Amino acid sequence: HSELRKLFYSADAVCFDVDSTVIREEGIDELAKICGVEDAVSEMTRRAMGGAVPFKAALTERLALIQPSREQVQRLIAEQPPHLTPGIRELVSRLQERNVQVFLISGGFRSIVEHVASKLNIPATNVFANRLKFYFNGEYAGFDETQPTAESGGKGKVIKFLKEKFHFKKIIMIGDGATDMEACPPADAFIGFGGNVIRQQVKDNAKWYITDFVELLGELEE
Amino acid sequence: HSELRKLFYSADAVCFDVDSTVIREEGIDELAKICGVEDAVSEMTRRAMGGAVPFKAALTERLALIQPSREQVQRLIAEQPPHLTPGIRELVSRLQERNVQVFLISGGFRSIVEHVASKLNIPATNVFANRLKFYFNGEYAGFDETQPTAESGGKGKVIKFLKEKFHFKKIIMIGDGATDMEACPPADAFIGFGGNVIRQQVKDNAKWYITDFVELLGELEE
């Protein structure tokens, strides 16, 4: 490697997804374990490796199986399961003094990915996670179907939604798997993360890879 | 009272309609007010006159403009704007005691009628109404579109489900409008109330019509 200094310098805006990337654990699964469907959803997710049934589809099932209450989601952010990864926190901290815009694009729910984006001074207007719906009686009522990250290609769309609006110069994407690596083309660049989860799909096969921000906080601290 | 004696006990169950009958106040017009959007609404309810039901979409437009929040309605419920009709907080009990099962029926949000029930000692299982949806933030999302009271003539689609399920063979519906009377052919005996609103299209055309409620309770007292 040699293009990690300038590459990460000529940047104008960078963004990464929450699940297993900016957060150690998985929102959906950490949200199911609170119920009793951990085993189900977890397998329901990993079985959804590639384009095997669009995202929107599997999202409803996996969610219909869960049926989370506002109370539940309100007490998760209370037991604050989302844990930041060893690096990230700072990596973006010093990235804000550089004016370089930072973003969060996860298949998760802002109901949560928003609390995460707080430990990091990232305004909510820079978050992109489908939303959860509830009844005044505090009971699962589905999710917002008009959310770009609700179905496949979602992540790579929100990015473009950003270029045809912010006219950026260098936009980088960092995910913990090809499950969203295919967004580099829309964007201006990508980095596969693997500190919490590897997956060959991104491991050996991915330009500018990485594992654990710390094990790259140096080339950055340089 | 000529032959109304048969009705009112010696019946089975009497489903009351809340808007304009069990409560003087309006279910939605009252909400559009705490939403800072009354008159805005008070002009949509104009050309959309009775007998003509674009409905559902008519309710979605009307709610689309109000956009209530779990908090906003919460503050309304906490302000208890609804005022039950004089002879109800007492007459409702005058049938339950006689082991008669009373039911509240509406198309104006369950978040309200539930308290209406709870403040009338009417079971929570005997309240059918529309359900609004909110986001974690509490913003407006929509409403249950499967709920019976969603589409036109739903007043009956339920008055009929309450039969194939509980069986009553003698159920009465207390209403004030043509939609309350329109559930009669599907239901049993219908009594029109007008202690809040008259609505000629149902007064001089529907059999059995009482002006006040106390002029029905203070009768079987001797």
Coordinates of C-alpha atoms in Angstrom, one line a residue:
Chain A
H1 CA 0.0 0.0 0.0
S2 CA 1.1 3.6 -0.7
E3 CA -2.2 5.4 -1.5
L4 CA -3.5 5.8 2.1
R5 CA -2.0 9.2 2.9
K6 CA -3.2 11.4 0.0
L7 CA -6.3 9.2 -0.6
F8 CA -7.5 9.9 2.9
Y9 CA -6.4 13.5 2.5
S10 CA -8.0 14.5 -0.8
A11 CA -11.2 13.4 0.9
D12 CA -14.1 15.8 1.1
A13 CA -16.6 13.5 2.9
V14 CA -16.5 9.9 4.3
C15 CA -19.3 7.6 5.6
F16 CA -19.7 4.1 7.1
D17 CA -22.5 1.8 8.2
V18 CA -23.3 1.2 11.8
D19 CA -23.7 -2.6 12.0
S20 CA -20.5 -4.3 12.8
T21 CA -18.6 -1.3 11.5
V22 CA -19.1 1.8 13.6
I23 CA -20.8 -0.3 16.3
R24 CA -19.4 -3.7 17.6
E25 CA -22.8 -5.4 17.7
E26 CA -25.7 -5.7 15.4
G27 CA -28.7 -3.5 16.0
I28 CA -31.3 -6.0 14.6
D29 CA -29.8 -9.0 16.4
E30 CA -29.2 -7.0 19.7
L31 CA -32.8 -6.0 19.3
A32 CA -34.0 -9.5 18.9
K33 CA -32.0 -11.0 21.7
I34 CA -33.9 -8.7 24.0
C35 CA -37.0 -10.6 22.8
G36 CA -36.3 -14.3 22.2
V37 CA -35.7 -14.5 18.6
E38 CA -32.0 -14.1 18.7
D39 CA -31.3 -17.6 17.1
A40 CA -33.9 -17.1 14.4
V41 CA -33.0 -13.6 13.1
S42 CA -29.3 -14.2 13.4
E43 CA -29.6 -17.1 11.1
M44 CA -32.2 -15.2 9.1
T45 CA -29.6 -12.6 8.5
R46 CA -26.5 -14.6 7.7
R47 CA -28.5 -16.7 5.3
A48 CA -29.1 -13.4 3.5
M49 CA -25.5 -13.2 2.3
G50 CA -25.9 -11.9 -1.2
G51 CA -28.8 -10.7 -3.3
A52 CA -30.7 -13.7 -1.9
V53 CA -34.2 -12.0 -1.6
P54 CA -33.9 -8.2 -1.6
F55 CA -33.5 -6.3 1.6
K56 CA -36.9 -4.8 1.9
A57 CA -38.4 -8.4 1.8
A58 CA -36.3 -10.1 4.4
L59 CA -36.5 -6.9 6.6
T60 CA -40.2 -7.3 7.2
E61 CA -40.1 -11.0 7.8
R62 CA -37.1 -10.8 10.2
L63 CA -38.9 -7.9 11.7
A64 CA -42.4 -9.4 11.7
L65 CA -40.9 -12.3 13.6
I66 CA -39.5 -9.8 16.1
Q67 CA -42.4 -7.3 16.7
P68 CA -40.5 -4.8 19.0
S69 CA -42.3 -2.4 21.3
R70 CA -41.3 1.3 21.7
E71 CA -40.7 0.3 25.4
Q72 CA -38.3 -2.4 24.2
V73 CA -36.3 0.0 22.0
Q74 CA -36.4 2.7 24.7
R75 CA -34.9 0.2 27.2
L76 CA -32.2 -1.0 24.7
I77 CA -30.8 2.5 24.4
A78 CA -31.0 2.5 28.2
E79 CA -28.9 -0.8 28.5
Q80 CA -27.1 1.1 25.6
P81 CA -26.0 -2.1 23.8
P82 CA -24.4 -0.3 20.9
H83 CA -20.7 -0.3 21.7
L84 CA -18.3 1.9 19.7
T85 CA -15.3 0.3 18.1
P86 CA -11.8 1.0 19.6
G87 CA -10.9 3.4 16.8
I88 CA -13.8 5.2 15.1
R89 CA -14.6 7.6 18.0
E90 CA -11.5 9.6 17.5
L91 CA -10.8 8.8 13.8
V92 CA -13.8 10.9 13.0
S93 CA -13.2 13.4 15.9
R94 CA -10.1 14.9 14.2
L95 CA -11.9 14.5 10.9
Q96 CA -14.4 17.1 11.9
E97 CA -11.7 19.7 12.6
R98 CA -10.8 19.1 8.9
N99 CA -14.3 20.1 7.9
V100 CA -14.6 16.8 6.0
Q101 CA -18.2 15.7 6.2
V102 CA -19.0 12.4 7.9
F103 CA -22.0 10.1 7.4
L104 CA -23.7 7.0 8.7
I105 CA -25.5 4.6 6.4
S106 CA -26.9 1.4 8.0
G107 CA -29.7 -1.0 7.4
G108 CA -30.4 -0.3 11.1
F109 CA -33.0 1.9 12.7
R110 CA -32.3 5.5 13.6
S111 CA -34.4 4.7 16.5
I112 CA -30.9 3.5 17.5
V113 CA -28.2 4.5 14.9
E114 CA -29.0 8.0 16.1
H115 CA -27.9 7.4 19.7
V116 CA -24.7 6.0 18.3
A117 CA -24.1 9.0 16.0
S118 CA -24.2 11.0 19.2
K119 CA -21.1 9.7 20.9
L120 CA -19.7 11.1 17.7
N121 CA -20.6 14.7 17.0
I122 CA -22.6 13.9 13.9
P123 CA -25.9 15.8 13.5
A124 CA -29.0 13.7 12.9
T125 CA -29.3 15.3 9.4
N126 CA -26.4 13.1 8.5
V127 CA -28.0 9.8 9.5
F128 CA -29.6 7.3 7.1
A129 CA -31.4 4.3 8.8
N130 CA -34.9 3.1 8.0
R131 CA -37.4 4.1 10.8
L132 CA -39.5 2.0 13.2
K133 CA -43.3 2.7 13.6
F134 CA -45.3 2.3 16.8
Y135 CA -48.9 2.6 18.1
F136 CA -49.8 5.3 20.7
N137 CA -50.2 2.2 22.7
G138 CA -46.4 1.6 22.2
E139 CA -46.6 -1.4 19.9
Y140 CA -44.9 -2.5 16.7
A141 CA -46.7 -1.0 13.6
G142 CA -44.2 -1.8 10.9
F143 CA -41.5 0.5 9.5
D144 CA -41.2 3.4 7.1
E145 CA -41.4 1.9 3.7
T146 CA -40.1 5.0 1.9
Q147 CA -36.6 4.8 3.2
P148 CA -33.8 4.4 0.7
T149 CA -32.1 2.0 3.0
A150 CA -35.1 -0.2 3.2
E151 CA -34.2 -2.3 0.2
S152 CA -31.2 -3.5 -1.8
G153 CA -29.0 -0.9 -3.5
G154 CA -30.2 1.4 -0.7
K155 CA -26.8 2.3 0.6
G156 CA -25.3 3.0 -2.8
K157 CA -28.3 5.2 -3.5
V158 CA -28.2 7.4 -0.4
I159 CA -24.6 8.1 -1.4
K160 CA -25.6 9.3 -4.9
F161 CA -28.5 11.2 -3.3
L162 CA -25.5 13.0 -1.6
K163 CA -23.5 13.7 -4.8
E164 CA -26.4 15.1 -6.7
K165 CA -27.0 17.4 -3.8
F166 CA -23.6 18.2 -2.1
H167 CA -21.5 18.0 -5.2
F168 CA -18.6 16.4 -3.2
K169 CA -15.1 15.8 -4.5
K170 CA -14.0 12.7 -2.6
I171 CA -16.5 10.4 -1.0
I172 CA -15.3 7.3 0.8
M173 CA -17.4 4.3 2.0
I174 CA -16.4 1.8 4.7
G175 CA -18.4 -1.2 5.5
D176 CA -17.7 -4.5 7.2
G177 CA -18.6 -6.5 4.2
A178 CA -19.4 -6.6 0.5
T179 CA -22.9 -6.6 1.8
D180 CA -22.5 -2.9 1.0
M181 CA -19.1 -2.8 -0.7
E182 CA -20.8 -2.5 -4.0
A183 CA -21.3 1.2 -3.2
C184 CA -17.7 2.3 -4.1
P185 CA -18.6 2.9 -7.7
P186 CA -21.4 5.3 -6.9
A187 CA -19.1 6.8 -4.2
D188 CA -15.5 7.8 -4.9
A189 CA -13.9 5.1 -2.8
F190 CA -14.3 2.2 -0.4
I191 CA -12.5 0.4 2.5
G192 CA -13.6 -3.0 3.8
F193 CA -13.7 -3.3 7.6
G194 CA -13.3 -6.5 9.6
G195 CA -12.5 -5.7 13.2
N196 CA -15.8 -7.2 14.4
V197 CA -16.5 -9.4 11.4
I198 CA -14.3 -10.4 8.4
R199 CA -16.1 -12.4 5.6
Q200 CA -13.8 -13.3 2.7
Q201 CA -16.3 -11.5 0.4
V202 CA -14.4 -8.3 1.5
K203 CA -11.3 -9.7 3.1
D204 CA -8.8 -10.9 0.4
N205 CA -11.0 -9.4 -2.3
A206 CA -11.1 -5.6 -1.8
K207 CA -8.9 -2.7 -2.6
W208 CA -7.7 -0.7 0.4
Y209 CA -8.9 -3.2 3.0
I210 CA -8.4 -2.9 6.8
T211 CA -9.1 -4.4 10.2
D212 CA -9.5 -2.5 13.3
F213 CA -9.3 1.3 12.9
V214 CA -6.5 1.2 15.5
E215 CA -4.5 -0.9 13.0
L216 CA -4.7 2.0 10.6
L217 CA -5.0 4.9 13.1
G218 CA -1.3 5.1 12.7
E219 CA -1.1 5.6 8.9
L220 CA -3.7 8.3 9.8
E221 CA -1.9 9.6 12.9
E222 CA 1.0 10.0 10.4
Chain B
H1 CA -91.0 4.2 24.8
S2 CA -94.1 3.1 22.9
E3 CA -92.3 -0.2 22.1
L4 CA -88.8 0.8 22.9
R5 CA -89.1 -1.2 26.1
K6 CA -87.9 -4.3 24.1
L7 CA -84.8 -2.3 23.3
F8 CA -82.7 -1.2 26.2
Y9 CA -82.3 -4.4 28.2
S10 CA -84.2 -7.5 27.1
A11 CA -81.7 -7.1 24.2
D12 CA -78.1 -8.3 24.5
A13 CA -75.5 -5.7 23.9
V14 CA -75.6 -2.0 22.8
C15 CA -72.7 -0.6 20.7
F16 CA -72.5 3.2 21.3
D17 CA -70.9 5.6 18.8
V18 CA -68.6 8.1 20.4
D19 CA -68.3 11.0 18.1
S20 CA -71.2 13.5 18.6
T21 CA -73.2 10.9 20.7
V22 CA -71.3 9.5 23.7
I23 CA -69.3 12.8 23.8
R24 CA -70.5 16.2 22.6
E25 CA -67.0 16.9 21.2
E26 CA -65.6 15.9 17.8
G27 CA -63.0 13.2 17.6
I28 CA -60.8 14.7 14.9
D29 CA -61.9 18.3 14.8
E30 CA -60.6 18.4 18.5
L31 CA -57.3 17.0 17.4
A32 CA -56.8 19.3 14.5
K33 CA -57.1 22.1 17.1
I34 CA -54.3 21.1 19.4
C35 CA -52.4 20.7 16.2
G36 CA -52.6 24.4 15.4
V37 CA -54.5 23.4 12.2
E38 CA -58.3 23.8 12.9
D39 CA -59.6 26.2 10.3
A40 CA -57.2 24.6 7.9
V41 CA -59.2 21.4 8.4
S42 CA -62.6 23.1 9.0
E43 CA -62.6 23.8 5.2
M44 CA -61.9 20.3 4.0
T45 CA -65.0 19.0 5.7
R46 CA -67.0 21.3 3.4
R47 CA -67.4 19.9 -0.1
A48 CA -66.9 16.5 1.4
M49 CA -70.6 16.4 2.6
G50 CA -72.5 13.4 3.9
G51 CA -73.9 10.5 1.8
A52 CA -70.7 11.0 -0.3
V53 CA -67.8 8.9 1.0
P54 CA -64.4 9.2 -0.8
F55 CA -63.4 8.0 2.7
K56 CA -60.2 6.4 4.0
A57 CA -58.2 8.6 1.5
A58 CA -60.5 11.3 2.9
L59 CA -59.3 10.5 6.4
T60 CA -55.6 10.2 5.3
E61 CA -55.8 13.6 3.7
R62 CA -57.4 15.0 6.8
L63 CA -54.8 13.4 9.0
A64 CA -52.0 14.3 6.6
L65 CA -52.7 17.9 7.2
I66 CA -53.0 17.5 11.0
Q67 CA -50.0 15.3 11.5
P68 CA -50.5 14.6 15.2
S69 CA -47.7 13.5 17.4
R70 CA -47.7 10.8 20.1
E71 CA -46.9 13.8 22.3
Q72 CA -49.5 16.2 20.9
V73 CA -52.3 13.7 21.2
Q74 CA -50.8 12.8 24.6
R75 CA -51.2 16.4 25.7
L76 CA -54.7 16.5 24.4
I77 CA -55.6 13.3 26.3
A78 CA -53.9 14.8 29.3
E79 CA -56.2 17.9 28.8
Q80 CA -59.2 15.5 28.5
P81 CA -60.8 17.9 26.0
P82 CA -63.6 15.3 25.4
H83 CA -66.7 15.8 27.5
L84 CA -69.1 12.9 27.7
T85 CA -72.8 13.6 27.2
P86 CA -74.8 14.2 30.4
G87 CA -76.7 10.9 30.6
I88 CA -73.9 8.4 29.8
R89 CA -71.4 8.2 32.7
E90 CA -74.5 6.9 34.5
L91 CA -76.6 5.2 31.8
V92 CA -73.8 3.0 30.6
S93 CA -73.6 1.4 34.1
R94 CA -77.4 1.1 34.0
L95 CA -76.9 -1.7 31.4
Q96 CA -73.7 -3.3 32.5
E97 CA -75.3 -4.0 35.9
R98 CA -78.0 -5.7 34.0
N99 CA -75.2 -7.8 32.7
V100 CA -75.5 -6.1 29.3
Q101 CA -72.2 -5.9 27.3
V102 CA -71.6 -2.3 26.0
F103 CA -69.2 -1.5 23.2
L104 CA -67.7 1.8 21.9
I105 CA -67.5 2.2 18.1
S106 CA -65.5 4.9 16.3
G107 CA -63.3 6.0 13.4
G108 CA -61.5 8.6 15.5
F109 CA -58.4 7.1 17.1
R110 CA -58.2 4.5 19.8
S111 CA -55.8 6.7 21.8
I112 CA -58.8 8.7 22.8
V113 CA -61.8 6.4 23.1
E114 CA -59.7 4.1 25.4
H115 CA -59.6 6.8 28.0
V116 CA -63.2 7.5 27.2
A117 CA -63.9 3.9 28.1
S118 CA -61.6 3.9 31.1
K119 CA -63.3 6.9 32.2
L120 CA -66.7 5.2 31.7
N121 CA -65.7 1.9 33.2
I122 CA -66.2 0.3 29.8
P123 CA -63.8 -2.6 29.1
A124 CA -60.8 -2.0 26.8
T125 CA -61.8 -5.0 24.8
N126 CA -65.1 -3.3 23.9
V127 CA -63.6 -0.4 21.9
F128 CA -63.0 -0.5 18.2
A129 CA -61.5 2.5 16.5
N130 CA -58.6 3.6 14.2
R131 CA -55.0 3.3 15.3
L132 CA -52.5 6.0 14.7
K133 CA -48.8 5.2 14.3
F134 CA -45.9 7.3 15.6
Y135 CA -42.0 7.1 15.1
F136 CA -39.6 6.9 18.0
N137 CA -39.3 10.7 17.7
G138 CA -43.1 10.7 18.1
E139 CA -43.7 12.2 14.6
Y140 CA -46.8 11.2 12.8
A141 CA -46.5 8.0 10.7
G142 CA -50.0 7.0 9.6
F143 CA -52.7 4.6 11.0
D144 CA -53.8 1.0 10.9
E145 CA -55.2 0.5 7.4
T146 CA -56.5 -3.0 8.1
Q147 CA -58.5 -1.9 11.2
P148 CA -62.2 -2.3 10.3
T149 CA -63.1 1.3 11.0
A150 CA -60.6 2.1 8.3
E151 CA -62.8 2.0 5.2
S152 CA -66.5 3.0 4.5
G153 CA -69.3 1.1 6.2
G154 CA -66.8 -0.3 8.7
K155 CA -69.3 0.4 11.5
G156 CA -71.1 -2.6 10.3
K157 CA -68.2 -4.9 9.2
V158 CA -67.5 -5.0 13.0
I159 CA -71.1 -5.1 14.3
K160 CA -71.2 -8.2 12.2
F161 CA -67.9 -9.7 13.5
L162 CA -69.1 -9.2 17.0
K163 CA -71.9 -11.7 16.1
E164 CA -70.1 -14.6 14.3
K165 CA -67.9 -14.4 17.4
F166 CA -69.9 -13.5 20.5
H167 CA -73.4 -14.2 19.3
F168 CA -76.0 -11.8 20.6
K169 CA -79.1 -12.2 18.4
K170 CA -80.2 -8.9 19.8
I171 CA -77.8 -6.0 19.5
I172 CA -78.6 -2.3 19.4
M173 CA -76.5 0.5 17.9
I174 CA -76.8 4.1 19.2
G175 CA -75.8 6.6 16.5
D176 CA -76.2 10.2 15.3
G177 CA -75.3 10.0 11.6
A178 CA -76.0 8.2 8.5
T179 CA -73.0 6.0 9.0
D180 CA -74.3 4.9 12.4
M181 CA -77.7 4.1 10.9
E182 CA -76.1 2.4 7.8
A183 CA -74.8 -0.3 10.2
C184 CA -78.4 -1.1 11.1
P185 CA -79.3 -3.3 8.1
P186 CA -76.1 -5.3 9.0
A187 CA -76.9 -5.0 12.8
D188 CA -80.2 -5.2 14.7
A189 CA -82.3 -2.3 16.1
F190 CA -80.9 1.2 15.7
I191 CA -81.6 4.2 17.9
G192 CA -80.5 7.6 16.7
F193 CA -79.1 10.2 19.2
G194 CA -78.9 13.9 18.7
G195 CA -78.0 15.3 22.1
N196 CA -74.9 16.8 20.3
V197 CA -75.9 16.8 16.6
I198 CA -79.2 16.3 14.8
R199 CA -78.5 15.5 11.1
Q200 CA -82.0 15.5 9.6
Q201 CA -81.0 12.9 7.0
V202 CA -81.4 10.3 9.8
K203 CA -83.9 11.9 12.2
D204 CA -87.0 12.0 9.9
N205 CA -86.2 8.7 8.3
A206 CA -85.0 6.4 11.0
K207 CA -87.4 4.8 13.5
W208 CA -86.8 5.5 17.1
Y209 CA -85.0 8.8 17.7
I210 CA -84.3 10.5 21.0
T211 CA -83.3 14.1 21.5
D212 CA -81.6 13.8 25.0
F213 CA -80.3 10.8 26.9
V214 CA -81.6 11.7 30.4
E215 CA -85.1 11.5 28.7
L216 CA -84.4 7.7 28.4
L217 CA -82.7 7.0 31.8
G218 CA -85.1 8.8 34.0
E219 CA -88.0 6.7 32.6
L220 CA -87.3 3.1 33.7
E221 CA -87.0 4.6 37.2
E222 CA -90.8 4.2 37.6

